[PDB]
Subunit: 346 residues, 5 copies
């Protein structure tokens, strides 16, 4: 019989009336293109740019009655991408591309196969740099929702409808791990149908819920902001009434508390609102600034001066050091309980 | 009847006399191309480079009498971008491109449709990195005006005229939020007609007013420059005449005031003029440098030495500490009122 | 006789029935493509992105019975890359490309030669930026395993099978040195056959074992974290009961221990788990934080006050300075033995 | 009559003997191409790379007698860039390109028009990243001279000559402002004719004089290097013979003078010679290092010890503090006059 | 007579038997291609990536007897790069490309001219980013040897041989200066013939010797590491037996010695071996760490306590300050002689 590439030329080229510029079922019902993606790679989720890079296999299935052969004995004719400009393909695009490219190493990484009844599978490999608005109200404990939406660009709703297939519309690779996030298994699949002044265009989208790994910030952000507060509590014991060294422990633990406060937001977007790591680095700034402010209460009370008025100020310069030495591990411990319960509920 | 893509070939190709190199209404009135854009994405507004990235849908409408079919029953013939080099298109360009590319993922993201009377809609998707000169005289409280202008490159004013359409010439996407700025709703639409030695070329432009979010700099730039000034006011209470610790609080709050002064302009352009954050970080440098300069007045007066001359210098080393402890929260509070009223008016 | 380029046109083009879109041995056994690579350049192994760049010569050998000439006198007909779109080529791709390009300087860097029996050698030059997941549990002493896998994209397992040749399937250049790593000579070669819902696709992969050079981190990370611990041991000798200078050596060696702790992870991914350099910079932070905490035990015990109770606290303020001066070089030396034996075993 | 695009095809294509591979006036006098540029954008003048980005309109005018129509009624026939590979064009290149691209958004941004006598205007839009060697001997007060030169690549001097036109050979845009530099109005226009072993090739070049804005470095580099010198002069007043606090003001104002000295050259090329900002940060390092070296002369003389020898060293420990308190504002003020006069003359 | 472009079409195209896929002197001696380069630009020699960027004119001369016209009156026929795919060209490539591109601004920057006897000159413009392994054993005083090598890709040694011409095989531009290095005039030209399992391929290479400019590191690395050692020698004079200020000068000059030690390798590759700047920043770390360790010997000996035993320890607390004040400018001056003589010999 015929070879497939010679048989598929006479099914399409110039003699069968197949025109690649005209959609299937023309002047009839719209073409129902069904889609599913396979995420090979994921990540490099930046926050200065608020974008993330993904590497997908975009599979598109539709029906084309002009490609429905009947007499050839096989069940699926492939088509290499040299002759891929000879069929109709849906004009899918991503509504938040922000730059994207194909992969064309050793061959155009494109797949096409045509069944007997006309079902056309079309799988391409794309690298996307998708845009998602980061919501950083509770920054080390947030759950980001970064989406990707697949629209049509030229055909309206009465000509081309996108659908997610019911048999697992988003597959993820086997050992896909992210360095900072984890990809949750439940992925929302909903519609995003756009209305312009040109017309109404089809749109489908998949949500990805990206929960952070808190274990990094619990090593660099929280514990070196915890030990500086303990280091400011050393000043309550040194020389117990007055020294030129309690000031040096009161000055210096505000410096590296302030430097770490600016260092906690070194590679973050300049958001207007206050976030979760800001109400930690400003309350633990308050517990290390009140320690030097506590000595200024001591060295002003104890530097006041008959026979009765001698010990009456030392009795006010030891009660200020046996209460402010125990009440600060009560106020800081009741803040540390109210903080983490709030961000466990939210 | 005929399919549209076969009908549209005989409307243009080689038999109807349609030449795609010749503008409509030739040797007559100029072509009135009307334009409107749709900002999908906005942002990454850099200031080291003084540019911003935008992602638009550029729609262009004109009239072409050679494309006015009459006998075909429909109202709008589309045209896929494989045959888009066969019509006339206006040679629009952006006068401040600084690099711009199309989007060509899964299909050339281009749209064309031709009405019965000859009206041609032409929507393409462009990513621009536009240039706008930043005016940073009042830096955290400024209202930037970044423009984009759409010129003709080859046709003069007597051959091709650009207009903004009256029905919403600039649309913005629904949930378009910027991390640092806000986009005001009033967008100016004015002309920018260029005159060269080649001729006079048409130009239209849209201004975008970008107001900053002050809430970021009010957390990192102002409050850690506010607490260092309060930290320098602790030195008026410590030991009340003389210490080796008031110097240590006088030195160190100039260090991290100077380090934060260089740290306030880490990612900014090297502008010649003085800005709003510079007359905050240099006046709050003055209140923390005059505190150590105040102790140098104390430790020089109080280190002077009959029976009457003993208490006469302590009476000059306490009046210098009961006035300079209250006058500095008067001068700093009258500066802080004159500062913010100035930048609320401007 | 004929020149080779004219003889090779009639072997393939339009008269011999050779169709370049159809694989060899069609409707028969699968094509057995055998592969080997030649790593020219290697390196720029980043960890923020977790990727590495390689520069290979990808050689592919297969059999094509339609190219088996018999009457031409030579043994190997070459073919320049201008006519390289005329044979069948396997659609190999790398399953973790993350961007890759050819090299096209002065000529397409591509090779093709055809033997008499039909063996086809096909060598191209590719630059890859391959992805490998970094496992940083024991960070300066880890052995990374970064792989590269070579799948088919269009042909399933019953049409195209990849193999590594038995005669040295991965060659490395003569003087290939890495700045941070060393490439071990044993390279694993195993199968990675993928199963999708499209079909099952062939895959071969080569593991590369990249052992680090520990000598860099033993100069910047370990020795300047070793001398700060010795510098905190200077405070046990200074003035031997009480000073305002032991606090100044107790504060300051916690500052540059914490600053170096944040400086130890300046260009690393934000992993959740704790690594080998973190249980050094948090234990040597403990020995420099316990030194200031030791003086707080001294200056609180020695500041307590009949005739018998005078020397009883100095006898408790010297035993605390002749034991804590020797026990800290016992606890730090027994940690330093348990640390390096653990990472020598693992 | 004829449309212009059909008339211009028979003037060139295959019937008039016009060959686009052959220069005008062949085997005769050389082609006199005259050039002028229009700088749209300028800037991003880097110094680590020593290059600057420009965005020009390159206009080229020459004469081509084969394109001299006589009977067509118009005076100027345009030509869209689709048929622009059909005329002869000069093979101009930039001898210091370092990468350059065209602009191809919505149309190839290219212009061509042909007069009646044969004069051909050819305007294109290029983005260049031109290389200029920076001379940083006097760094914040220098006048850079960054050039751009336009050579021929294939035709020698006896076949093609470039000239600048006399009517404004370099135009600059209306509101072109640079953030760091200013572009002087006088632009030198001179020749740069190259001699290779291939031949001698034409070359023209324009010099651009880029004077800096000193006002930025006078806020960050000079004033925080001025106040540290005044801060070191506070140590002459504190306790007036001896303290543990004059050392703390002698140590610390060397630290942030050395840190600012390394911070003054954070983003500069690693030049070998000494520059103007180096002999400010090394002389003001000397005035803050000699202040601590002055106290080491005080605390060594005043710590020497009959009844006559008591006040003879205090008379040497007050003369050292009433001269070194006035002579240092004399030496620093006579340096500050000799410094700025030197860089005002040069 | 004929124009040259029409004469050169009948010399090659389809009638003269010229096939552009077949090398000259086929089934005979190999083609002797002779090469020389012209370095326009050089530099951006990075060391994190260990690569350098060069911008060359690659000239190639071979002989092609099929292009040997005899009857045309000229001596050299040029050929514009539109018809440059019609001759045979050698498939040269660079064996350490790491990315390279042509220059195609206003015309393909390519040159071709054919002499009467068949000699073909072929000059193109290439930008290369070449790889060279940096050897940093003696880092500020090293002489790098970065090479570039020119291989054949498709033709073996018995078909194509590269040579350097004897008339100046590497030219350098007139005013080519590097910011950090200097390019030595003696350039080695040697062979690098490769042996693969495909065959043996020709290769020629040019060594470039890049001697550094030590004058930058002698301002930032060595002098601020010299004054800190002098600053640690101030502590021998302050208060001469005991103070809380000698410790503060002993602590702080270890801090900024350690910070500058990490700051000396901010933008360097993470090499395993020790380099020349590391045995300066670790010996000058030793002279500033032994100064604080010297006071710990003083304040432990002088704090020991009949009538005879009073002055016997002051006699041991002044001999330790009149020897350790002169021996440290003897050990540091004998190190500073042994250091620079070692790196002057090597
Ligand atoms: C692509 O999918 C759409 C959506 O499922 C299909 O449109 C649907 O087609 C069916 C049968 O043609 C329509 O059912 C009909 O409903 C009318 C009342 O409107 C009634 O006379 C019958 O019950 C009849 O079954 C259905 O309304 C229609 N839905 C929409 C939203 O248009 C379309 O046929 C699919 N096209 C292809 C090529 O598969
Ligand atoms: C594109 O838009 C321009 C601007 O509206 C149109 O030009 C205008 O055309 C009208 C009618 O052709 C001109 O009005 C005429 O004015 C003359 C006096 O100059 C008088 O005899 C009549 O009152 C007549 O209506 C109008 O002057 C002219 N304006 C300009 C600035 O040229 C043009 O016709 C439009 N072209 C197309 C193809 O739509
Ligand atoms: C490509 O490689 C595969 C794998 O080596 C080859 O397939 C193998 O082909 C041989 C002979 O055609 C098969 O042996 C046969 O086994 C059957 C029992 O199944 C028995 O009747 C005989 O012993 C006979 O030798 C072998 O089973 C088969 N293996 C597989 C996994 O398919 C294939 O022939 C190679 N193709 C080319 C073009 O070199
Ligand atoms: C392009 O520009 C060059 C330079 O202006 C033109 O070359 C010049 O052409 C004129 C007239 O052809 C030459 O003048 C002649 O000088 C000879 C003595 O050499 C004498 O017999 C006459 O006085 C005559 O006028 C002039 O020497 C020559 N200059 C050079 C440097 O070649 C050229 O003609 C221009 N070409 C075109 C196509 O415009
Ligand atoms: C390209 O360059 C190579 C190397 O210079 C040339 O090969 C050399 O060709 C000469 C003459 O054809 C050979 O000399 C011959 O030597 C044999 C002994 O082997 C003897 O019968 C004669 O003395 C005769 O002169 C020489 O051996 C040969 N060298 C090599 C290494 O092959 C080649 O001819 C050049 N090709 C062109 C087209 O210029």
């Amino acid at each position: 019989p015929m070879p497939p590439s010679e048989f598929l030329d006479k099914l399409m080229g110039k003699v069968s009336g197949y025109d690649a510029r005209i959609r299937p079922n023309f002047k009839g019902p719209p073409v129902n293109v069904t889609c599913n993606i396979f995420i090979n790679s994921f990540g490099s989720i930046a926050e200065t740019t608020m974008d993330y890079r993904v590497n997908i296999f975009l599979r598109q299935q539709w029906n084309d009655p002009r490609l429905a052969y009947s007499e050839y004995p096989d069940d699926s004719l492939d088509l290499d991408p040299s002759m891929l400009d000879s069929i109709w393909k849906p004009d899918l695009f991503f509504a938040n591309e922000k730059g994207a490219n194909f992969h064309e190493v050793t061959t155009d990484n494109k797949l096409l196969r045509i069944s007997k009844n006309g079902n056309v599978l079309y799988s391409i490999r794309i690298t996307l740099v998708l845009a998602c608005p980061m919501d950083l109200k509770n920054f080390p404990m947030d759950v980001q929702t970064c989406i990707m939406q697949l629209e049509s660009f030229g055909y309206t709703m009465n000509d081309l409808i996108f659908e997610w297939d019911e048999k697992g519309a988003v597959q993820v690779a086997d050992g896909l791990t992210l360095p900072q996030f984890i990809l949750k298994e439940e992925k929302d699949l909903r519609y995003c149908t756009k209305h312009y002044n040109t017309g109404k265009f089809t749109c489908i989208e998949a949500r990805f819920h990206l929960e952070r790994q808190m274990g990094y910030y619990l090593i660099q952000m929280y514990i070196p902001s915890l030990l500086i507060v303990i280091l400011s509590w050393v000043s309550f014991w040194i020389n117990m009434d007055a020294a030129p060294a309690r000031v040096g422990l009161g000055i210096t633990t505000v410096l590296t508390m302030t430097t770490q406060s600016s260092g906690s937001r070194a590679s973050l977007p300049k958001v207007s609102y206050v976030k979760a790591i800001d109400i930690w680095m400003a309350v633990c700034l308050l517990f290390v600034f009140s320690a030097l402010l506590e000595y200024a209460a001591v060295n002003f009370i104890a530097r006041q001066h008959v026979e009765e008025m001698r010990k009456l100020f030392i009795s006010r310069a030891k009660r200020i050091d046996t209460v402010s030495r125990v009440a600060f591990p009560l106020v800081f411990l009741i803040f540390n309980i109210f903080y983490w319960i709030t961000y466990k509920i939210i």
